[PDB]
Structure formats: C-alpha cells, structure tokens
C-alpha cells in the first residue's frame, strides 16, 4: 500500500507514535517519506547481505528474520515479510523497540540526514488528526 501523507500520519498516531520516546509525529512521517516513499512494500538490500523492509525500512541483521541473513538477530520476533503488510502494526511495534534501544531515531539514516533538525511539523500540516 502507498499511503497518503495525512493517512499515514493518522495511522501512526492511532498506533501510539506521536511523541513516542519524545519524537513528535512529524518525525515519524518524515522518516517514512524518505525511507520508503510511504510504500509498505519497499525493500532494499544492504552491502552486508541484510535487507531493509517496509515503510520504515527495518533491517534484517537485527530486527526481523528473513531466512537469508546469516548470524542475524530477530529482536522484534517477526518474519521480515510481516513488515510489508498494508497494516502498519508490525512495523510500528518493531519501530518502538528500535527507537527505545538507546540511539533514538538515529537508527534511521534518512531521518538523521533528511529530517533531524528540520521543521518536521510541516509533514503533518493540514492533516485532520
Ligand atoms: Cl510534528
Ligand atoms: Cl532520543
Ligand atoms: Na535477522
């Protein structure tokens, strides 16, 4: 599913991401925009053989099992394919574990490089939330 900007903002808010660990909703929408272009089916392979999955591009080296990342952990205890659903629940629940592990949203490279320190509230402007 390719989410609209306000549609995704509303779904993220319903799933408890607004101000989760101090990150306002706009940070999460901005991160999703630049990680996946709001596409739940996005996948991208990394140089170490791991793959990033879903709207928030969660990495198989640590967070999910895709059966093809040797020596990897599955800290969210999910198959990576669950992160590609039109239902963002699995992605949100796993993102909450990631953002809580000490490094905050810096775990998302696109957030650090394209959202951090910008007016992220612009990403939810005009939305009925
Ligand atoms: Cl915001
Ligand atoms: Cl933080
Ligand atoms: Na894994």
From Swiss-Prot:
Tissue specificity of this protein: In the egg white and polymorphonuclear leukocytes.
Disulfide bonds: 6-127, 30-115, 64-80, 76-94
InterPro entries referenced in this protein's UniProt entry, alphabetically: Glyco_hydro_22, Glyco_hydro_22_CS, Glyco_hydro_22_lys, Lysozyme-like_dom_sf
UniProt catalytic activity: Hydrolysis of (1->4)-beta-linkages between N-acetylmuramic acid and N-acetyl-D-glucosamine residues in a peptidoglycan and between N-acetyl-D-glucosamine residues in chitodextrins
Binding site for substrate: 101
Keywords: Allergen, Antimicrobial, Bacteriolytic enzyme, Disulfide bond, Glycosidase, Hydrolase, Secreted, Signal
Residues forming the catalytic site: 35, 52
GO molecular function per UniProt: beta-N-acetylglucosaminidase activity; identical protein binding; lysozyme activity
E.C. numbers: 3.2.1.17
Origin superkingdom: Eukaryota
Pfam family, one: Lys
GO process terms (BP): cell wall macromolecule catabolic process; defense response to bacterium; defense response to Gram-negative bacterium; defense response to Gram-positive bacterium; killing of cells of another organism
Subcellular location: Secreted
Role: Lysozymes have primarily a bacteriolytic function; those in tissues and body fluids are associated with the monocyte-macrophage system and enhance the activity of immunoagents. Has bacteriolytic activity against M.luteus.
UniProt record similarity statement: Belongs to the glycosyl hydrolase 22 family.
Entry protein name: Lysozyme C
Lineage: Eukaryota, Metazoa, Chordata, Craniata, Vertebrata
Gene: LYZ
